[PDB]
Design a protein around this ligand. Structure first.
Ligand code: 8OY
Length: 190
């Protein structure tokens, strides 16, 4: 059970190729402490985990999540330890290969929102749908950090204050990971 943390691009996932929202268009609807699915590249069949919180902080919208899919963790761990392809774009001989592989191959966190037309009015249903781990499409700076404890993960971001991290982590620790439903990811290898 891994944690992920980082700053999100907020996107609408539209006939358009892409719409990147300014964070101030959605901050009225934060924080979100109920679990949203975490998927790969906005694919609904690639659920790998669950969000733990979405928070407005000074330097953007920060996401903390849990990567919990057994099939995904088993596959990513095996590739990290045995695949020269997965290791090719990472530094030689990392101490924590799984964490480095995810940091390199899935560096972008994106938060799916409804369209701004509804955000300015009064939305009827949920404003956010999922967070995705992304290999393309990154607009803002910083990248995702993966690690085995949420404190370490969030403390890697210098732009998150001591008090911001404490607010973020206040909720993260209150979440019990094993009682999260199993995400739907299946290994491509079958
Ligand atoms: O079914 C197929 O034909 C197929 C082909 C390509 C795939 N993935 C890619 O092309 C691809 C590109 C960037 C990032 C990733 C995810 C990342 C997960 C952990 C280890 C390294 C890769 N996948 C995937 N998806 C996938 C691959 C590995 C792990 C998880 C999903 C499926």
């Amino acid at each position: 059970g891994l944690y992920v943390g980082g700053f999100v691009d907020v996107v609408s996932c539209p006939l358009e190729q892409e719409l990147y929202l300014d964070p101030d268009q959605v901050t009225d609807y934060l924080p979100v402490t109920e679990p949203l699915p975490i998927t790969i590249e906005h694919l609904p069949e690639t659920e790998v985990g669950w969000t733990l919180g979405l928070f407005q902080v000074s330097h953007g919208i920060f996401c903390t999540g849990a990567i919990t899919s057994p099939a995904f963790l088993e596959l990513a761990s095996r590739l990290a330890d045995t695949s020269h392809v997965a290791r090719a774009p990472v530094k030689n001989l990392p101490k924590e290969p799984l964490l480095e592989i995810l940091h390199t191959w899935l560096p972008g966190l994106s938060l799916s929102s409804i369209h701004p037309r509804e955000l300015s009015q009064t939305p009827s249903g949920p404003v956010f749908q999922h967070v995705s781990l992304c290999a393309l499409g990154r607009r803002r700076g910083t990248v995702a950090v993966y690690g085995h404890d949420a404190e370490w993960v969030v403390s890697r971001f210098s732009s998150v204050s001591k008090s911001e991290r404490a607010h973020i982590l206040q909720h993260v620790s209150s979440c019990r990971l094993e009682d999260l439903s199993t995400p739907n990811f299946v290994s491509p290898l079958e």
